Design a protein around this ligand. Structure first.
Ligand SMILES: Nc1ncnc2c1ncn2[C@@H]1O[C@H](COP(=O)(O)OP(=O)(O)OP(=O)(O)O)[C@@H](O)[C@H]1O
Ligand SMILES: Nc1ncnc2c1ncn2[C@@H]1O[C@H](COP(=O)(O)OP(=O)(O)OP(=O)(O)O)[C@@H](O)[C@H]1O
Ligand SMILES: Nc1ncnc2c1ncn2[C@@H]1O[C@H](COP(=O)(O)OP(=O)(O)O)[C@@H](O)[C@H]1O
Lengths: 185, 625, 620
DNA sequence: CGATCGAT
DNA sequence: ATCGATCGTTTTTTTTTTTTT
């Protein structure tokens, strides 16, 4: 649970970009890498366009969920998503930050875009407060992930559970122990 | 009959009267089958939440007619149960009481919210005020036609609506007779007062604020201004507010808690039994001596009898005399802090200033457009201490105007007083203390006994004893007092072989580590006592019956008082004390009488003994001996 | 809705609405959304704003905001609730109901002065800086309500006309005219109202005149915000309550033409930072501050550095000053379940030859959280007035304004004794009593006091014996450390005083080379430091301190009595319980400074040597 | 108890 | 022009505290 530990998870994802070289002072890595030719797209992870664009080496383009209409309809679906909604790559909250740092040198509409991502982030989080507002009787066998994303859940993780053990010990002891007529601890 | 959830709510309260809870307890033998007829019933919300929380907290957010419906449904219930009490055709509001704790703000903090709520207050009884009746409805009559119509009237302070404004009818039909029958036309009781913060939580960088209260019939004037109080009621705000000019508040819908009595105590005839069991123990007087002043040498053996008021003595259509005791003596540094052992220890304890005009006992009754036609009235600062005692500081610094104004009712033990508007009189038969200083500090014994004080020698007969209070030490006692004073400094602060910490237990705890600040019992249990036998509450629980018992005279009093008064007036005016033998008079008898009267109440021995004689003389000689 | 300009809609339509969603910098802090939501979470219902963001956003609003702010600053409220209620939805299910909010304003533009608040400066936003006197209680106000006659929540622009027609007209032709309005406060609202106050500055035309002042107003969250006797920075607005020019001439012989009244309401009061201008009750202080505090407390070179904080232009009197500040901190109000609330605060005496800088010193002790100064002939009988509205007998009751602060005075000698006695007394029990008219309100407040004086016959009395005071020994009683002031001669001392003050008194001298001294800095810091350190620690003794202090007071009284006997006549001050009862508070002040709770007797040998000044003063 | 205001 | 039905209409108090010479 951190700001970068999840980029060891999130930042390894890929897009496809354009460089301005062909195959470099080295040609290519023994690896899934594609052949390098300028003026044409190439598929890369996104821990490198970072390294490259600021190394003044390349241009870059986004995925397609980075748009307007998808991010105008996902929200209104998500409104009455009593549980969850559409999930474009499922950690777009980390890709978008590491995108929108530099690339907005030439990305289009990098502001209304940000507006919507915040607009969706806050709401989904806030939903993830009120899920708690029904949890009765120790329901630690019933929960939601179904179209969850991860950048929201780690914002809760250490809080409840290191408590929830001794919290619902009084009732988790119930289906794990025995006593006389009254409830057990 | 507004929105029809009201009737659903009626029957939801009818659904209170199902089984053991209310069909068993709360309905039946509750006001009317017990017949004290307090239409204001006792509800506690918690059971209502345990049936209908929609009616528990639907009430404490809105109370438009849920109360009206409650009273309606109740009267219809008992109409089923008991038509005998069906002759009180009114609302019969209810309690909705409790020592619950939902929201219990100060008078300071009824703050722009809580409007339309049922909540708590605490504060001071103040401005206990005048009474009036109120209009309900008028049973008219027409001898012309023999027709008795009727008409009820409202206003906001009772419920929501307002009368369709008009006065009482005349020729209302066409010209027939409108004989207003009273007696059938009815009336409640009304009242109006205010409260202040029992203030000592107040920030005196700020102003302790005020509240607004209204009351009604069976709630009428239930304690006196000068006491401590908690109360729980509902809230409303009527006036214009720029639709025309701004806004104001009011409180009602309530029952009381006065929180300073003894009859408040769940009193059997057992508490008397504990007292009378231990009553025989003889040298308990000395325990009560070391009781009230445990934080200071020094007296209080005698001060008790002030603290007990006195004894009533009247003759067959002859006279009456005032029964109570009064004394005082001292350079600065435990005199000025032996007066707040009463303000906050015993009841009916109202200190005064030393600087006071037009209401030390006056009223002056100045008035400006009261709600009613009160042309002249206020109250004062003595009946607050009726049937007890009083404190002051800076007495010698008091005016010599009102000193004589003390002497009036002090010496009379009567009120025949007024501020020239109406002659007024009653029986306030009070005692008092104050403080004192020699005009120059360290002088009362070298130069003279008298005249280091410098005032009228008239009062010294009005009071009881010339007495002594000084401060010096020789070469030997200094370390004795040092160890006494250092017991004062340590038996008050908490927490008082190679390694002795790291004991099986430590200061590490859950919920009984330090309450405020702990104290010792070591060697004050060499003083074989207990914190309950030597305490506040069992002490005060032995207040009432010594005030109810009445220890009549023996017979051996007479020869002894004779011989001792004889020797007193013989040779008390000699041996270095002559100028402190000025006030001898035929007044030591009645004070001796109050003495043995009191002391015979401290064990309640409705009797008299020679030991009491020693007890009531020895202090008098100890004044100088 | 005349959509050409000044329209009801354009602002709210998107502009104000989107200003905040649009308010952006990376670091993803730089909005007012986070502050808003996190404020809401804790029942705040407000947020703070600038006035030079419009330059960050645009070039039009502000020169329109100043003109009709009364409307713009409620369009702000509406936009605020609609832009925030979308976030009140976690999904549509937890807006149990919306709620109303208050905006703030602030700037650093410039403070004005009351002498210019004029007919041009009206209905217009502003900035000033004054000082506070007293202000009202907390009455009431609301916004709308319903009436049974119409059953509509009565909606208003202004914060009354109530027209003719009945609206219980569905009675047939038998209607109810002539204004039958039954106000239904089941259906009304409730906001606050407090009437703040304002006096003008001490340098801005009081010169050949007196200072005027002004009264104020509030609505919702600026009650419980200002305690009086404080220095404010303000943004408010200058407007009226009534209206009219023509020959409906007012009253009986009033209003030649049209005079209506002044006041202001606040839109965004703030406070002052005269070093620590406003550090008296609240805490906007941060963890860096408290680290600073405790790490200076950790510094074991803080007290002697603080012996040099009031005298950066003053020479000498260092043994005199080792406890001139210990007065400030206060010890402990160690109260007990019985009456014995043993005396909390602390009191000091000083008197001697003039020409020794008593006045300036007490001015400075006022300077350095809360205090006042008069001296003789007159802060505070206490005041039972009679309200000119309604003629009720209220109590203004002004040691109340030292309810935790302190007091300083000279001129105990030079004022008569009709007014010494209530204050003779207050400072042994701290309970201001009252018994005069129909009230018995034993008020109270924790003040201390500093006592300077002037002996008639000067050092003559001080050479030989008993002419010390002219008035009484019962106020020789109440004080602990009591100081002669002489000006005994020495030419070295003379010359050193000479250049010491001239180097002060030359060209407004010490700007640069003054603070380069060690750590003797920022009386502002001391305001904050004091208002901290007193507000936490409640120390009391250690065991080893008690026996030696006890034995020391023993020997004190024995030596006083021996000087009584070594002269065959009383040669002593009264060895009181008050002397130990006060030196205990000197220990308490010391432990309050270093913050160590439990204090040892080496900590208080310093106390021993300081009240030894009083002992050897009244030694003769 | 006074003036406004409408029609006959 | 005349009459009648419309509109809108309200006033009552004495005395206590601190201050100055
Ligand atoms: N034996 C004692 N009992 C109670 N208090 C004591 C005792 N010895 C000392 N004290 C304390 O010492 C302090 C001395 O002040 P004290 O109250 O005597 O002044 P005072 O009596 O008001 O002076 P004055 O009589 O001139 O007004 C008090 O705070 C008191 O609590
Ligand atoms: N030792 C000194 N060092 C520096 N400045 C001094 C010193 N003594 C006096 N001064 C200056 O002289 C002036 C003294 O005036 P001040 O009002 O203190 O008189 P005072 O000492 O209070 O006499 P009194 O008590 O009789 O009024 C002050 O302005 C102060 O700055
Ligand atoms: N000759 C007397 N007859 C009756 N009572 C007397 C007589 N001499 C003294 N007393 C006592 O004096 C009291 C009344 O005295 P009082 O007139 O108050 O004295 P003073 O004139 O000093 O005020 C009575 O209570 C009684 O106890």
């Amino acid at each position: 649970m951190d700001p970068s530990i999840i980029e060891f998870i999130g930042e390894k994802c890929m897009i496809s970009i354009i460089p301005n070289f062909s195959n470099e002072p080295l040609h290519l890595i023994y690896g899934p890498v594609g052949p390098f030719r300028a003026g044409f797209p190439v598929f890369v992870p996104l821990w490198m366009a970072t390294h490259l664009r600021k190394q003044q080496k390349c241009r870059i383009v986004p995925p397609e969920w980075m748009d307007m209409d998808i991010l105008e309809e996902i929200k209104e679906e998500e409104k009455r998503s009593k549980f969850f909604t559409k999930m474009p790559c499922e950690h777009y909250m980390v890709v978008a930050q590491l995108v929108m740092s530099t690339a907005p040198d030439d990305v289009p509409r990098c502001e209304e875009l940000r507006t919507v991502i915040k607009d969706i982030f806050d709401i989904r989080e806030s939903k993830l407060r009120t899920s708690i507002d029904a949890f009765i009787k120790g329901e630690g066998t019933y929960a939601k992930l179904d179209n969850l994303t991860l950048l929201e859940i780690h914002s809760v993780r250490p809080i409840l559970p290191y408590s929830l053990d001794h919290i619902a010990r009084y009732q988790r002891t119930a289906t794990a122990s025995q006593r006389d007529t009254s409830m057990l601890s | 009959e507004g929105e029809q959830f009201i009737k659903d709510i009626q029957r939801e309260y009818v659904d209170f009267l199902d089984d053991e809870e209310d069909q068993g307890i709360y309905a039946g033998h509750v006001k009317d089958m017990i017949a004290e007829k307090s239409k204001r019933l006792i509800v506690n919300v918690n059971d209502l939440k345990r049936k209908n929380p929609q009616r528990a907290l639907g009430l404490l957010s809105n109370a438009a007619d849920e109360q009206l419906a409650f009273g309606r449904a109740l009267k219809e219930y008992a109409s089923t149960v008991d038509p005998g009490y069906a002759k009180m055709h009114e609302d019969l509001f209810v309690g909705f009481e409790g020592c619950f704790g939902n929201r219990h703000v100060t008078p300071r903090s009824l703050t722009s919210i809580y409007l339309g709520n049922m909540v708590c207050v605490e504060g001071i009884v103040t401005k206990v005020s005048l009474i009036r009746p109120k209009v309900v409805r008028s049973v008219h009559y027409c001898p012309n036609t023999r027709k008795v119509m009727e008409r009820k009237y409202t206003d906001l302070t009772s419920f929501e609506a307002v009368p369709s404004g008009a006065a009482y009818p005349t020729k209302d039909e066409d010209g027939n007779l409108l004989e207003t029958e009273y007696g059938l036309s009815v009336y409640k009781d009304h009242q109006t007062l205010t409260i202040q913060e029992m203030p000592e939580k107040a920030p005196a960088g700020q102003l302790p604020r005020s509240v607004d209260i209204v009351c009604d019939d069976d709630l009428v004037d239930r304690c006196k201004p000068g006491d401590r109080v908690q109360i729980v009621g509902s809230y409303r705000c009527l006036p214009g507010k720029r639709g025309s000019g701004t806004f104001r508040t009011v409180l009602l819908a309530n029952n009381i808690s006065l929180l300073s009595k003894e009859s408040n105590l769940d009193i059997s005839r057992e508490d008397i039994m504990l007292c009378k069991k231990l009553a025989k123990n003889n040298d308990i007087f000395e325990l009560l001596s070391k009781s009230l002043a445990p934080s200071i040498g020094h007296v209080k053996q005698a001060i008790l009898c002030l603290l007990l008021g006195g004894v009533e003595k009247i003759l067959p259509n002859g006279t009456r005399l005032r029964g109570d005791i009064n004394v005082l003596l001292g350079d600065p540094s435990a005199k000025s802090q032996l007066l707040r052992y009463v303000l906050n220890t015993a009841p009916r304890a109202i200190p005064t200033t030393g600087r006071g005009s037009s209401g030390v006992g006056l009223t002056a009754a100045v008035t400006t457009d009261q709600e009613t036609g009160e042309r002249r009235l206020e109250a004062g600062a003595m009946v607050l201490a009726d049937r007890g005692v009083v404190c002051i500081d800076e007495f010698d610094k008091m005016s010599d105007i009102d000193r004589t104004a003390i002497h009036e009712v002090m010496e009379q033990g009567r009120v025949t007083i007024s501020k020239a508007g109406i002659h007024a009189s009653l029986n306030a038969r009070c005692s008092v203390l104050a403080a004192a200083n020699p005009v120059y500090g360290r002088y009362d014994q070298y130069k003279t006994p008298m005249e280091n004080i410098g005032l009228q020698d008239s009062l010294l007969s009005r009071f009881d004893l010339l007495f002594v209070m000084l401060d010096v030490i020789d070469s030997d006692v200094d370390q004795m007092i040092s160890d006494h004073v250092v017991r004062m400094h340590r038996y008050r602060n908490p927490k008082e072989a190679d390694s002795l910490s790291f004991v099986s237990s430590s200061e590490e705890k859950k919920d009984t580590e330090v309450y405020e600040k702990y104290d010792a019992l070591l060697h004050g249990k060499s003083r074989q006592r207990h914190e309950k036998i030597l305490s506040v509450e069992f002490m005060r629980k032995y207040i009432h019956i010594a005030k109810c018992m009445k220890p009549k005279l023996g017979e051996q009093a007479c020869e002894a008082i004779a011989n001792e008064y004889s020797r007193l007036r013989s040779q008390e005016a000699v041996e270095t004390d002559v100028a402190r033998t000025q006030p001898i008079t035929a007044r030591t008898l009645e004070t001796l009488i109050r003495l043995s009267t009191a002391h015979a109440r401290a064990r309640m021995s409705k009797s008299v003994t020679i030991d009491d004689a020693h007890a009531a003389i020895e202090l008098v000689q100890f004044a100088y001996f | 809705n005349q959509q050409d300009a000044q329209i009801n809609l354009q602002a709210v339509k998107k502009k104000y609405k989107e200003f905040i969603r649009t308010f952006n910098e990376e670091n993803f802090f730089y909005k007012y959304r986070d502050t808003l939501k996190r404020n809401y979470l804790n029942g705040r219902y407000f947020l703070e704003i600038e006035m030079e963001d419009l330059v960050g956003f645009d070039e039009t609003l502000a020169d329109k905001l100043n003109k009709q702010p009364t409307e713009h600053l409620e369009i702000f409220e509406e936009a605020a609730r609609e832009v925030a209620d979308e976030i009140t939805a976690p999904r549509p299910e937890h807006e149990e109901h919306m709620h109303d909010i208050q905006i703030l304003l602030s700037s650093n533009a410039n403070p004005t002065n009351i002498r210019q608040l004029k007919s041009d400066c009206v209905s217009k936003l502003v900035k000033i800086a004054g000082i506070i006197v007293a202000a009202s209680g907390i009455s009431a106000k609301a916004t709308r309500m319903s009436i049974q006659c119409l059953s509509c929540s009565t909606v208003i622009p202004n914060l009354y006309a109530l027209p003719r027609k009945c609206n219980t007209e569905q009675a047939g032709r038998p209607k109810c005219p002539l204004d039958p309005f039954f106000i239904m406060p089941d259906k009304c609202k409730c906001v606050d109202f407090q009437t703040l106050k304002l006096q003008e500055l001490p340098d801005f035309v009081p010169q050949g005149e007196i200072p005027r002042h002004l009264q104020l107003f509030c609505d919702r969250s600026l009650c419980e915000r200002v305690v009086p006797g404080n220095r404010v920075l303000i943004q408010g607005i200058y407007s009226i309550r009534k209206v009219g020019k023509p020959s409906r001439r007012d009253g009986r012989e009033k209003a030649v033409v049209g005079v209506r009244a002044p006041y202001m309401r606040v839109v965004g009061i703030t406070v002052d930072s005269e070093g620590a201008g406003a550090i008296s009750r609240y805490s906007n202080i941060t963890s860096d501050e408290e680290e600073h505090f405790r790490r200076m407390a950790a510094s074991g070179d803080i007290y002697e550095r603080l012996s040099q904080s009031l005298a950066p232009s003053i020479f000498g009197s260092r043994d005199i000053k080792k406890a001139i500040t210990c007065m400030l901190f206060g010890g402990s109000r160690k109260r007990l379940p019985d009456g014995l609330c043993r005396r909390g605060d602390i009191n000091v005496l000083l008197l001697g030859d003039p020409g020794t800088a008593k006045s300036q010193l007490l001015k400075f002790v006022e300077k350095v959280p809360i205090a006042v100064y008069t001296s003789g002939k007159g802060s505070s009988t206490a005041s039972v007035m009679k309200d000119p509205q309604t003629r009720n007998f209220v109590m203004e009751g002004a040691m109340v304004l030292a309810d935790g602060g302190v007091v300083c005075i000279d001129e105990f000698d030079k004022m008569r004794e009709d007014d010494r006695v209530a204050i003779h007394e207050a400072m042994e029990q701290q309970t201001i009593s009252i018994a005069k008219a129909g009230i018995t309100t034993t008020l109270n407040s924790r003040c201390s006091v500093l006592a300077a004086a002037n002996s008639i016959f000067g050092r003559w009395d001080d050479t030989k014996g008993e002419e010390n005071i002219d008035f009484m020994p019962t106020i020789l009683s109440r004080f602990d450390m009591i100081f002669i002031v002489k000006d005994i001669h020495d030419e070295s001392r003379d010359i050193t005083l000479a250049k010491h003050i001239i180097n002060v008194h030359l060209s407004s001298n010490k700007s640069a080379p003054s603070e380069p001294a060690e750590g003797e800095i920022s009386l502002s810091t001391f305001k904050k430091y004091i208002h901290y350190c007193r507000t936490h620690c409640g120390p009391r003794l250690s065991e080893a301190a008690g026996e030696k202090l006890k034995s020391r007071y023993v020997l004190m009284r024995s030596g006083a009595g021996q000087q009584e006997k070594a002269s065959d006549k009383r040669l002593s001050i009264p060895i009181t319980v008050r002397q130990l009862e006060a030196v205990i508070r000197i220990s308490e002040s010391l432990a309050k400074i270093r913050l160590q709770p439990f204090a040892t007797d080496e900590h208080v040998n310093e106390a021993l040597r300081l009240f030894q000044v009083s002992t050897l003063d009244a030694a003769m």
